[PDB]
Amino acid sequence: HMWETLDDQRALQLALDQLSLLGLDSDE
């Protein structure tokens, strides 16, 4: 189901923002 309304965009941006705080793309 591919439909996105404003709440879909907001919730996705928020989840990504939350997860970008974790530094999952850091290279040791």
Partner 1 sequence: DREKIYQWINELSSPETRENALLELSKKRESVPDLAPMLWHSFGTIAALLQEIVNIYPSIPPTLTAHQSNRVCNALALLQCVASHPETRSAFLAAHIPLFLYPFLHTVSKTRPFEYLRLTSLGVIGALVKTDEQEVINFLLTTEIIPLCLRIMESGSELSKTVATFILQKILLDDTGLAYICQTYERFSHVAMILGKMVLQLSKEPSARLLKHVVRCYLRLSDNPRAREALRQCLPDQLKDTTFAQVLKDDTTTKRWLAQLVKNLQ
For partner 1, the binding residues (CB under 8 A) are 1, 4-5, 7-8, 10-12, 14-16, 18-19, 21-25, 27-28
- Least distance (Å) from partner 1 to the CB of residue 17? 8
- Least distance (Å) from partner 1 to the CB of residue 20? 9
- d(CA 16, CA 22) in angstroms, rounded, equals 10
- Least distance (Å) from partner 1 to the CB of residue 9? 9
- d(CA 14, CA 20) in angstroms, rounded, equals 10
